[PDB]
Scaffold this active site. Sequence first.
Site, PDB file in Angstrom:
ATOM      1  CE  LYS A   1       9.353 111.888  23.191  1.00 17.23           C
ATOM      2  NZ  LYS A   1       8.200 110.925  23.194  1.00 17.23           N
TER       3      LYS A   1
ATOM      4  CG  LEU B   1      14.441 102.982  22.356  1.00 15.21           C
ATOM      5  CD1 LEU B   1      15.904 102.812  22.738  1.00 15.21           C
ATOM      6  CD2 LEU B   1      13.944 101.730  21.632  1.00 15.21           C
TER       7      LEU B   1
ATOM      8  CE  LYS C   1      20.090 116.415  29.889  1.00 16.07           C
ATOM      9  NZ  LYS C   1      18.956 117.376  29.737  1.00 16.07           N
TER      10      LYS C   1
ATOM     11  CB  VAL D   1      32.928 107.534  51.716  1.00 12.59           C
ATOM     12  CG1 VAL D   1      33.248 106.910  53.098  1.00 12.59           C
ATOM     13  CG2 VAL D   1      34.181 108.265  51.169  1.00 12.59           C
TER      14      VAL D   1
ATOM     15  CB  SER E   1      26.137  88.639  41.485  1.00 17.19           C
ATOM     16  OG  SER E   1      27.318  88.825  42.269  1.00 17.19           O
TER      17      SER E   1
ATOM     18  NE  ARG F   1      21.834  87.596  39.366  1.00 17.56           N
ATOM     19  CZ  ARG F   1      22.246  88.635  40.083  1.00 17.56           C
ATOM     20  NH1 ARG F   1      21.838  88.790  41.326  1.00 17.56           N
ATOM     21  NH2 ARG F   1      23.075  89.527  39.549  1.00 17.56           N
TER      22      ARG F   1
ATOM     23  CG  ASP G   1      27.565  92.715  48.564  1.00 19.17           C
ATOM     24  OD1 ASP G   1      27.149  91.721  47.955  1.00 19.17           O
ATOM     25  OD2 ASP G   1      26.807  93.664  48.863  1.00 19.17           O
TER      26      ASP G   1
ATOM     27  CG  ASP H   1      22.751  89.591  51.101  1.00 22.91           C
ATOM     28  OD1 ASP H   1      22.695  89.510  52.350  1.00 22.91           O
ATOM     29  OD2 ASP H   1      21.862  90.139  50.411  1.00 22.91           O
TER      30      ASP H   1
ATOM     31  CG  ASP I   1      24.912  93.244  53.997  1.00 23.35           C
ATOM     32  OD1 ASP I   1      25.859  93.883  54.513  1.00 23.35           O
ATOM     33  OD2 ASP I   1      24.134  93.753  53.155  1.00 23.35           O
TER      34      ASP I   1
HETATM   35 MG   LIG Z   1      23.098  92.065  47.292  1.00 23.49          MG
HETATM   36 NA    NA Z   2      28.082 106.464  50.016  1.00 28.87          NA
HETATM   37 NA    NA Z   3       9.857 106.986  24.757  1.00 30.25          NA
END
Ligand SMILES: [Mg+2]
Ligand code: NA
Ligand code: NA
EC number: 2.7.7.7
Length: 331
Positions: free
Chosen positions: A56, A58, A68, A99, A176, A179, A186, A188, A252
């Site tokens: 809690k 955090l 939970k 999908v 990525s 980076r 994928d 880009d 992309d």
């Molecule tokens: Mg991307």
């Molecule tokens: Na999807």
């Molecule tokens: Na908190």
Amino acid sequence: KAPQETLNGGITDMLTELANFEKNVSQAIHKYNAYRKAASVIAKYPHKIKSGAEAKKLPGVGTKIAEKIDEFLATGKLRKLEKIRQDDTSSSINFLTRVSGIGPSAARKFVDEGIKTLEDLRKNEDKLNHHQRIGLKYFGDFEKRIPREEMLQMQDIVLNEVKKVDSEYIATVCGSFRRGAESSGDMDVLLTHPSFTSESTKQPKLLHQVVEQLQKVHFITDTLSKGETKFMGVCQLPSKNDEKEYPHRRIDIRLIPKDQYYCGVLYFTGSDIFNKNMRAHALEKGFTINEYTIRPLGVTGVAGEPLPVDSEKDIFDYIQWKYREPKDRSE
DNA sequence: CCGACAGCGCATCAGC
DNA sequence: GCTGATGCGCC
DNA sequence: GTCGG
Ligand SMILES: [Mg+2]
Ligand code: NA
Ligand code: NA
Ligand SMILES: [Mg+2]
């Protein structure tokens, strides 16, 4: 940088699963993000959480998640998640969203009609749109990771063909990969051209000609969508004699006006976490950075006119931040 | 209590 | 036909 | 679901 998943993995996996169910079944994107936010801060916590009260403390963890966590620490599970998991409708809706092209609405519509598996999608291909048929066709491949060596071979092809179409194009592979990641999800690609600036006529041909050349050399194999500024499709490396074909990958390609190019490279290089941190810093220094521009903030917080940007560094300069190498942009 | 949580390109739906 | 809304994918 | 006006 991150602590062993062994520390709080049970908790982080539980929160991520809850997140997915909120996104895909409940259609509550903000609760999906709340759970992802809680999962992330807990993943970064370098101690084994012993109670919900401890969690809690955090930021992102509130009363419900703390509760939970206590149930999880006491029983090793969450009754609500156990039930969700075994629910045929929720499980099926959640699975179909894997999908590409099938989001929460289509997933629900399908399951409502008795379509719950990839086999069911195949028997009913006429109920799917173009994008969805493609996501179905490459279901497995789209979930595979792309090793960096294949990303390099892919980039060689893209850069080679783009220059071949017009030596004045400028293209940059972001994500990525830029980076420096050892694998990517994928590819880009951001492109611009001297003849295309924000005050230039919409030029769908500059993008189209690049897409067509990549299709001519058989690199791009399918198209999910394609407009004057953005292409979304599928590609595949040429196969090595006798060796098995490479899996098909998502690619992309974005055509961006030259005066908005570097803000774009910055944005699509990410990560999303680093971008949020950079946007937050910018605001603190009186600036606002989005995908297309960096603008000064007036006295009342109103964004003024776009500032001149000729490189990624110009953006860091404006906000008085030392230039961060892409490899240092995980956060 | 209750609004914010980012917003846009492209494909496709709803409706005039 | 066309406009505007929605679904989906995306840092 | 969490935060903060
Ligand atoms: Mg991307
Ligand atoms: Na999807
Ligand atoms: Na908190
Ligand atoms: Mg030339």
